[PDB]
Amino acid sequence: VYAWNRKRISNCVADYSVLYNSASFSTFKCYGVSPTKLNDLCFTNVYADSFVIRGDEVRQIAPGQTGKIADYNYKLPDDFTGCVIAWNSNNLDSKVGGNYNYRYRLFRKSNLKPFERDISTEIYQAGSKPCNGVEGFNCYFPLQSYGFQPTNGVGYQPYRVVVLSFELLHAPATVCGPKKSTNLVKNKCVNFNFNGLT
Amino acid sequence: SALGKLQNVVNQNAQALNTLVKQLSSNFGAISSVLNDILSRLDPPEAEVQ
Amino acid sequence: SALGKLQNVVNQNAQALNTLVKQLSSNFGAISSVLNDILSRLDPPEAEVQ
Numbered sequence: 001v002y003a004w005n006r007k008r009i010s011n012c013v014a015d016y017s018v019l020y021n022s023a024s025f026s027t028f029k030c031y032g033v034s035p036t037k038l039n040d041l042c043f044t045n046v047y048a049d050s051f052v053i054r055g056d057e058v059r060q061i062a063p064g065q066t067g068k069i070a071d072y073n074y075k076l077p078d079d080f081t082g083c084v085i086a087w088n089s090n091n092l093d094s095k096v097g098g099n100y101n102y103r104y105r106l107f108r109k110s111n112l113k114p115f116e117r118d119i120s121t122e123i124y125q126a127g128s129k130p131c132n133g134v135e136g137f138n139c140y141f142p143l144q145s146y147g148f149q150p151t152n153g154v155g156y157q158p159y160r161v162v163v164l165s166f167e168l169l170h171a172p173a174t175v176c177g178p179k180k181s182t183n184l185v186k187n188k189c190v191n192f193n194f195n196g197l198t
Numbered sequence: 199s200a201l202g203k204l205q206n207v208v209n210q211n212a213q214a215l216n217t218l219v220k221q222l223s224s225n226f227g228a229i230s231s232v233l234n235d236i237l238s239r240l241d242p243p244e245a246e247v248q
Numbered sequence: 249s250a251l252g253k254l255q256n257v258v259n260q261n262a263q264a265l266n267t268l269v270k271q272l273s274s275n276f277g278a279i280s281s282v283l284n285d286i287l288s289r290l291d292p293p294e295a296e297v298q
Contacts, residue, residue: 032229034241041238064293078293081229169235198234 001051001073002105002143003119009046010174015039017178025087026159027058032081033166042173042195049074049115049163052093052102054146055155058086061163072105074163077114082165090150093158100145102158107142115165169196 016038020028028035053061053069060067063080070076093099107124123131127138135141148158173195192198225231228248229239236248275281278298279289286298 033239034244036241037239064291066291078296079229168230168239196238198238 001053001069002103002117004049004051004074004117006115006117007048007050009048010044012175013178014046014175015178019085025085027084027086029062030083031063032079032168033083035083038083039177040179040193040196042176043166043168044171044173044175045165045167046175047163047165049165050160052089052158052160053104055088055157055159058084058159058161061086061161069104071111072108072118073112075112075114075116076163080114080165081168082163085162085164086159088157089160090148090157093160094148094150096150099148099158102148103143103145105142106144107140 016035019025020035020038030038033041051074057067057069059065060070061074061076061084063076063078065076093102105118107126108118109124112118121141121143123133123135123139124142125131125138126140129136129138131139146158150157176195179193223231228236230236230248236245239245240248273281278286280286280298286295290298
């Protein structure tokens with residue numbers, strides 16, 4: 001989550017109906033757009049932000065949330081449009097001895113901007129005493145690992161979260177829905193849909 | 199500027215119409231100022247609010 | 249009460265200005281009538297609503 005992966009999606013036709021109709025996702029929650037209207041609109045600036053978090057932290061992947069990974073790992077803007085996708089991954093991203101490959105930023109001086117990534121492995125000064133880049137008393141590494149075990153209860157089990165981020169109509173669009181194009185008629189009153197513009 | 203009294207009335211009426219037309223471009227706190235965009239993007243429970 | 253006609257105009261203008269000032273002390277359903285108190289007591293998602 002501190003180094004969440006951002007992938008650009010462009011120049012493709014996207015069928016979001018296979019995402020709504022799939023029951024694999026525990027949370028399929030969209031904010032600035034209806035989930036069922038995604039096949040009827042055209043988009044550009046589509047971004048997929050992929051990371052792994054806890055079970056109780058899936059509420060913090062939302063606009064306007066106060067939280068820990070919201071402030072120091074992954075921040076969403078107040079005017080965010082898109083969909084947050086979360087599904088349980090205890091069968092894949094957990095080990096009986098402890099899966100420690102997923103890390104979060106426990107310590108930071110200030111909250112992040114929306115869509116800001118911090119991968120800097122610099123030390124934090126948690127006390128009055130300066131640390132000088134060396135661990136010690138009140139000097140801790142900012143990145144700490146999750147202790148994922150399959151025997152743990154819900155709320156702490158690993159969840160895979162993908163955030164789809166869009167922009168609405170304010171640019172030429174390259175990602176569209178599976179709606180078929182009709183022929184054009186001249187000099188008649190029609191209700192048209194040009195790339196999501198109705 | 200001889201006929202300024204009539205031109206003031208004409209300008210005031212045209213300016214009032216222009217302001218009234220310009221006010222459609224404001225979203226007033228909604229996600230968009232275009233009704234078609236809201237009706238094509240959202241379900242009726244939240245489109246009702248917008 | 250000889251000059252009541254001018255005094256009414258002066259009183260109405262002063263009273264309208266005083267009422268416009270006193271409307272700032274009303275919260276209009278918000279938690280406080282002061283913007284600084286709202287900005288200091290709440291996060292921007294709810295401070296925006298207030």
